[PDB]
Amino acid sequence: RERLVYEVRQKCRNIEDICISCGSLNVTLEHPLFVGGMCQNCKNCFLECAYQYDDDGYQSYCTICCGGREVLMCGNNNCCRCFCVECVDLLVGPGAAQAAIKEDPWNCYMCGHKGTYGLLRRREDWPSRLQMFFANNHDQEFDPPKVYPPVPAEKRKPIRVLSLFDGIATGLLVLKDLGIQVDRYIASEVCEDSITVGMVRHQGKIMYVGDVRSVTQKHIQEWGPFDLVIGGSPCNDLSIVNPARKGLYEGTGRLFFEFYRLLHDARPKEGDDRPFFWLFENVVAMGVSDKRDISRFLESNPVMIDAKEVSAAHRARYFWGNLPGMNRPLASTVNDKLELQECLEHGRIAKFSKVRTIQHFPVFMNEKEDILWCTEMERVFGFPVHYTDVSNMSRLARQRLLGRSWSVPVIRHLFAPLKEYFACV
Amino acid sequence: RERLVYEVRQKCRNIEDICISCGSLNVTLEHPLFVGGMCQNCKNCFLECAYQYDDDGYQSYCTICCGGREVLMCGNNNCCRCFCVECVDLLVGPGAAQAAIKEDPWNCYMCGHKGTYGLLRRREDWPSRLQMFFANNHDQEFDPPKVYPPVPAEKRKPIRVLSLFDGIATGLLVLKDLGIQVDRYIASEVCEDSITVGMVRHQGKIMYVGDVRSVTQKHIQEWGPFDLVIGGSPCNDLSIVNPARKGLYEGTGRLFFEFYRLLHDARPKEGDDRPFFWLFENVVAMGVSDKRDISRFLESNPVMIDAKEVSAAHRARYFWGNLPGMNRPLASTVNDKLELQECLEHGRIAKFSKVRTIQHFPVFMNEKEDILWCTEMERVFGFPVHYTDVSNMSRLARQRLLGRSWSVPVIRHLFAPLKEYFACV
Ligand SMILES: Nc1ncnc2c1ncn2[C@@H]1O[C@H](CSCC[C@H](N)C(=O)O)[C@@H](O)[C@H]1O
Ligand SMILES: Nc1ncnc2c1ncn2[C@@H]1O[C@H](CSCC[C@H](N)C(=O)O)[C@@H](O)[C@H]1O
Ligand SMILES: [Zn+2]
Ligand SMILES: [Zn+2]
Ligand SMILES: [Zn+2]
Ligand SMILES: [Zn+2]
Ligand SMILES: [Zn+2]
Ligand SMILES: [Zn+2]
Numbered sequence: 001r002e003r004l005v006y007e008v009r010q011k012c013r014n015i016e017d018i019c020i021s022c023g024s025l026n027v028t029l030e031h032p033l034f035v036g037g038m039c040q041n042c043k044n045c046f047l048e049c050a051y052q053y054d055d056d057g058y059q060s061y062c063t064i065c066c067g068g069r070e071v072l073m074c075g076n077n078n079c080c081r082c083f084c085v086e087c088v089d090l091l092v093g094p095g096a097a098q099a100a101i102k103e104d105p106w107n108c109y110m111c112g113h114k115g116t117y118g119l120l121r122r123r124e125d126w127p128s129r130l131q132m133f134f135a136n137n138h139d140q141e142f143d144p145p146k147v148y149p150p151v152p153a154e155k156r157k158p159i160r161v162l163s164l165f166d167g168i169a170t171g172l173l174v175l176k177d178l179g180i181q182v183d184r185y186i187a188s189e190v191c192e193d194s195i196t197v198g199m200v201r202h203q204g205k206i207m208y209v210g211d212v213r214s215v216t217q218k219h220i221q222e223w224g225p226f227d228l229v230i231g232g233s234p235c236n237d238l239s240i241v242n243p244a245r246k247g248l249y250e251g252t253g254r255l256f257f258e259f260y261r262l263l264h265d266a267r268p269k270e271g272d273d274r275p276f277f278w279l280f281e282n283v284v285a286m287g288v289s290d291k292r293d294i295s296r297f298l299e300s301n302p303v304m305i306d307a308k309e310v311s312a313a314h315r316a317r318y319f320w321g322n323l324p325g326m327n328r329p330l331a332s333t334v335n336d337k338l339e340l341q342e343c344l345e346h347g348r349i350a351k352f353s354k355v356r357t358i359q360h361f362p363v364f365m366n367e368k369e370d371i372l373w374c375t376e377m378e379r380v381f382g383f384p385v386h387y388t389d390v391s392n393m394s395r396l397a398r399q400r401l402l403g404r405s406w407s408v409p410v411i412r413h414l415f416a417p418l419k420e421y422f423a424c425v
Numbered sequence: 426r427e428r429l430v431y432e433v434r435q436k437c438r439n440i441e442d443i444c445i446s447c448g449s450l451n452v453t454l455e456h457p458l459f460v461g462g463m464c465q466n467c468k469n470c471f472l473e474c475a476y477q478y479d480d481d482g483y484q485s486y487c488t489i490c491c492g493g494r495e496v497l498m499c500g501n502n503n504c505c506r507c508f509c510v511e512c513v514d515l516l517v518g519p520g521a522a523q524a525a526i527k528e529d530p531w532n533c534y535m536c537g538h539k540g541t542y543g544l545l546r547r548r549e550d551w552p553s554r555l556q557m558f559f560a561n562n563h564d565q566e567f568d569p570p571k572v573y574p575p576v577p578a579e580k581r582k583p584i585r586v587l588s589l590f591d592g593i594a595t596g597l598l599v600l601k602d603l604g605i606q607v608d609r610y611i612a613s614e615v616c617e618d619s620i621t622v623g624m625v626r627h628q629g630k631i632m633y634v635g636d637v638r639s640v641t642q643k644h645i646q647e648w649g650p651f652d653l654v655i656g657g658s659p660c661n662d663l664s665i666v667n668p669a670r671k672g673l674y675e676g677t678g679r680l681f682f683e684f685y686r687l688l689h690d691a692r693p694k695e696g697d698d699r700p701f702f703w704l705f706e707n708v709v710a711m712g713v714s715d716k717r718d719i720s721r722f723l724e725s726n727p728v729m730i731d732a733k734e735v736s737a738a739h740r741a742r743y744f745w746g747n748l749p750g751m752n753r754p755l756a757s758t759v760n761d762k763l764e765l766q767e768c769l770e771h772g773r774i775a776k777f778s779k780v781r782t783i784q785h786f787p788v789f790m791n792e793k794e795d796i797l798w799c800t801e802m803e804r805v806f807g808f809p810v811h812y813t814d815v816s817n818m819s820r821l822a823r824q825r826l827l828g829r830s831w832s833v834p835v836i837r838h839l840f841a842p843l844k845e846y847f848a849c850v
Contacts, residue, residue: 143643213721218568249675254718257682261722269694293679296638297686 005090009119020091021045021065029136032129033110034064034091035121042066044288047137051284051316052240053080057356060240062087063110072097074108078352081108091120134304140295145322148275150420158183159422160224162266164212164231164259165189168388169198170406171230172206174415177408181423186223188212193393193401200390212258220265225274227422229266231259232281235404239358240285248287260297275421279321279414281406285358286318294320303327305414307407312340312380314356315407324417336382336409343379344372355380357403374398382408430515434544445516446470446490454561457554458535459489459516460546467491469713472562476709476741477665478505482781485665487512488535497522499533503777506533516545559729565720570747573700575845583608584847585649587691589637589656589684590614593813594623595831596655597631599840602833606848611648613637618818618826625815637683645690650699652847654691656684657706660829664783665710673712685722700846704746704839706831710783711743719745728752730839732832737765737805739781740832749842761807761834768804769797780805782828799823807833 001023007013019027020036027037038046042065049066053059059082062068068084088097092109100106107113115122123129158181163171166187175182185202188209189195198206209215220226234252236242259280268276282294284304295302298320307315310332319326337343340350340362348365355362355372357380363370372380377399378387388398426448432438444452445461452462463471467490474491478484484507487493493509513522517534525531532538540547548554583606588596591612600607610627613634614620623631634640645651659677661667684705693701707719709729720727723745732740735757744751762768765775765787773790780787780797782805788795797805802824803812813823 213718217724254674254678257718257722260682264689271694293638293682297682299642 001090005119015119032133033123033126035123047288047291048286051358053285053356053358055241055243055360057359058082063108064091072100072106072108074111075104075106076108076111078354079108079111080356081110083108092117093119134302137301140292140301142295142299142301145300147324148273148421151275156421156423159418160227161185162220162223162226162229162262163187164229164262165233165255166198166206167191167194167232168401168405169202169206170383170408170411171415172198172202173384174408174411175418176202177412178415178419179425180415180419181425184224186226188215191401193391193397196391197388197401201387212255212262215258215262217265220262225268226266227275228277228279228418229263230279230281232406233259235283238283238286241358249290253290256294257297263298277321277323277418277421279319279323282318282320283358284316284318291318305330305410307381307410308354310336310338310409310413311382311407312337312343312354313407314354315358315381315410317407317410319414321414323414324420326414330410330413332409337379340380343376345376371399374402377402381405382412426515430544440544457558458548458551460548472713472716473711476783478710478781478783480666480668480785482784483507488533489516497525497531497533499536500529500531501533501536503779504533504536505781506535508533517542518544559727562726565717565726567720567724567726570725572749573698573846576700581846581848584843585652586610587645587648587651587654587687588612589654589687590658590680591623591631592616592619592657593826593830594627594631595808595833595836596840597623597627598809599833599836600843601627602837603840603844604850605840605844606850609649611651613640616826618816618822621816622813622826626812637680637687640683640687642690645687650693651691652700653702653704653843654688655704655706657831658684660708663708663711666783674715678715681719682722688723702746702748702843702846704744704748707743707745708783709741709743716743730755730835732806732835733779735761735763735834735838736807736832737762737768737779738832739779740783740806740835742832742835744839746839748839749845751839755835755838757834762804765805768801770801796824799827802827806830807837 004013004018004023008015008018015036016030017027018025018037019039019042020031020034021038021042024039024042026039028040029038029043030036031038045066049061050063052061058073058080061082062071062084063081064083064087068086071082071084072088074081085097088100109117109120109122159175160183161171161175163185166189169187172182172185182205185206186209187198187206188211190211195208233256237245237252238248263278268274280298291302300320302318302320303326305317305319307313309330332338340352340354344350344363348363350362351364352362361369361371363372374388374395375386378385381402388402429438429443429448433440433443440461441455442452443450443462444464444467445456445459446463446467449464449467451464453465454463454468455461456463470491474486475488477486483498483505486507487496487509488506489508489512493511496507496509497513499506510522513525534542534545534547584600585608586596586600588610591614594612597607597610607630610631611634612623612631613636615636620633658681662670662677663673688703693699705723716727725745727743727745728751730742730744732738734755757763765777765779769775769788773788775787776789777787786794786796788797799813799820800811803810806827813827
């Protein structure tokens with residue numbers, strides 16, 4: 001693309017007529033953040049790569065092209081973006097990257113105070129375009145989810161939940177917080193610590209099953225009709241945060257199908273018009289063909305929901321499902337804490353306003369750099385105070401346990417219209 | 426196990442009380458071919474490894490322990506077994522392997538003419554035990570397939586077939602050979618050569634679809650009710666014959682679920698008691714957890730069927746399904762050719778009686794070593810004479826095309842009782 005952008009700056013080619021990521025001429029889209037066109041292969045790359053972060057908490061690849069060999073990290077607080085040397089040679093000029101390295105307090109171009117440069121200019125409604133960009137994923141066209149008519153209030157009954165990959169029983173907790181009567185809560189999980197957390201916090205009510213692969217269709221039938229089936233595949237191997245990324249499709253992908261199977265096992269037959277609901281959860285840093293196969297099998301379009309809208313964590317997650325109002329915008333109640341500082345312990349001050357979890361140690365306390373405490377990690381994700389202090393487990397394990405979990409106010413947002421279909425306390 | 430077999434030969438321990446594969450004390454089974462016990466981990470290893478062959482046409486690992494670091498290949502004609510140096514040190518004695526290397530015309534212990542040795546003796550009903558060994562896979566317990574009562578002859582109608590991973594239309598060909606009227610034959614396939622083969626040989630009757638992943642439930646509904654859904658996942662990546670074995674679960678495993686999905690899409694509802702039948706096919710050289718997940722999802726027990734019983738090829742394949750009489754023993758009609766020589770062209774003589782396809786070049790013609798000709802490969806698998814000579818394709822591709830296919834008399838054996846449920850020509 002060096003010669004093509006030579007012709008762009010000579011006013012012989014429009015920058016909007018060229019794909020600013022790789023220099024392709026097959027322009028179909030516009031680049032959502034900056035000025036230029038966008039080809040489809042770069043859209044797939046952008047889907048996979050944009051929200052991939054390294055162990056330093058900064059982006060794994062360049063923000064522009066979603067590739068790049070050596071990148072520029074950003075000095076500005078809470079910003080995690082990177083711009084590779086090659087991109088800066090076109091849009092800011094030749095040698096601007098090598099000169100920009102030497103600028104010790106440097107701000108990236110999404111954070112630049114001027115907001116206007118010569119060849120590169122920032123497009124104004126970029127957050128709106130970022131939200132629209134996932135609606136722009138009409139390549140995987142699917143039929144709209146079947147809307148079930150509301151059951152009258154006197155006729156409502158307690159909800160029954162099959163919860164696969166339950167973890168620390170975030171789903172049941174949220175259902176309690178919403179005041180929905182829970183007839184029963186069947187849960188499959190294999191990690192003993194998470195089992196214990198659920199046992200204690202939910203007071204023996206949870207009927208514990210073993211591995212998901214031991215659950216047969218006969219099991220599904222004899223454990224009574226289910227009203228709500230929920231689950232989230234393992235995300236630790238999909239996430240770029242784990243240093244030992246042996247594979248992505250291995251382990252986690254197989255377990256996905258387990259959800260798939262039991263979903264069909266729990267689904268009412270056609271002609272049985274009783275209300276039935278399901279939710280699957282996954283990370284945004286995933287493969288495109290992976291995401292397609294998931295969308296193909298669950299026969300639906302993903303919704304991306306980021307917890308930043310309602311909580312103090314960057315937690316962007318896909319939610320497939322047929323719960324009513326899964327698309328509607330997220331509202332943050334006053335109880336929710338949109339600033340990191342409100343979630344800290346007294347005596348601590350946060351330089352950060354959000355913690356990126358999908359400047360390693362986020363806290364300045366007594367002029368020293370510390371990790372968030374376990375009870376604060378609970379407060380960040382919306383869990384009740386001292387939620388995971390049940391058994392005698394190490395801090396590393398307990399942090400890990402909290403880290404995998406669903407963001408509580410997001411899950412409250414999703415589960416809230418179920419109150420219109422089931423009984424209240 | 427060296428010290429344990431020291432105590433075995435001192436008449437202080439029974440060889441039947443020790444696992445002769447790895448020396449484990451957790452004896453649950455008996456070794457099917459030879460004298461000793463067998464632990465469960467070695468059973469899983471034996472399931473994965475026994476029918477794995479290298480590119481030389483001989484076994485990938487030792488026959489005894491299904492491991493081994495350096496193996497002894499067998500001199501006897503058509504025998505492909507290998508025995509590693511370590512195994513021969515216990516059962517035949519120390520240094521017997523190094524001395525046995527020096528014996529230039531050497532026979533392995535499954536082929537030895539005496540049939541009786543000191544520590545190792547061959548158990549007599551080993552083929553019967555080999556057949557029973559797959560019935561011995563009761564670890565994956567499942568309910569018996571639902572038997573549908575026979576429809577009266579006057580009421581019978583033409584069969585409708587959804588055929589995924591169709592290849593060269595072996596299924597429709599076999600249905601024609603059985604004289605079953607075929608209302609329609611919907612087929613998904615992506616390889617153009619195989620499409621062409623089916624087009625020509627089946628005279629435009631086949632309605633060709635694209636990739637299986639583009640077939641929706643709506644497609645399944647609007648293409649009319651299906652009476653028979655069949656398919657076999659890609660086996661080239663699972664097979665050890667391809668040198669570039671990057672993975673086994675990638676590509677082929679994902680495509681398996683496609684079958685799974687469309688099967689549920691094509692299945693009649695409960696309460697609709699109309700006859701419906703399905704068949705899935707796969708190779709025997711596969712992983713145990715892979716085989717378990719397949720058995721879990723199709724909710725059935727595999728049947729292993731080897732084509733040697735009815736054809737001139739070693740073609741051991743798993744068949745899941747609910748077709749009546751899928752367990753019953755295979756009969757070879759006089760038309761079928763149990764000897765390789767009958768399948769050769771005139772002027773050729775086969776040293777081999779069977780061709781192992783899952784001394785590379787199987788034929789001595791004019792005192793020279795040659796590959797089987799394409800028309801003979803067709804004759805080996807039971808295809809009609811000159812079946813794949815349709816378009817202008819290379820020999821390597823055309824052999825490959827034939828190689829993937831289902832064995833015709835095996836498929837005839839499976840499909841034969843469908844004549845009791847549908848209309849005849
Ligand atoms: N085979 C298996 N069966 C059930 N759970 C499993 C499993 N393998 C891994 N898991 C669990 O699946 C979870 C995935 S992340 C769980 C998030 C959950 N929604 C929460 O709020 O905590 C992990 O806790 C892991 O322990
Ligand atoms: N995505 C896909 N959709 C349909 N077929 C595919 C496919 N990917 C690979 N295949 C085909 O699946 C076949 C698997 S082996 C086919 C055997 C078949 N029963 C026969 O008699 O020939 C291959 O021919 C391969 O071309
Ligand atoms: Zn591009
Ligand atoms: Zn870049
Ligand atoms: Zn910045
Ligand atoms: Zn053993
Ligand atoms: Zn061995
Ligand atoms: Zn032999």
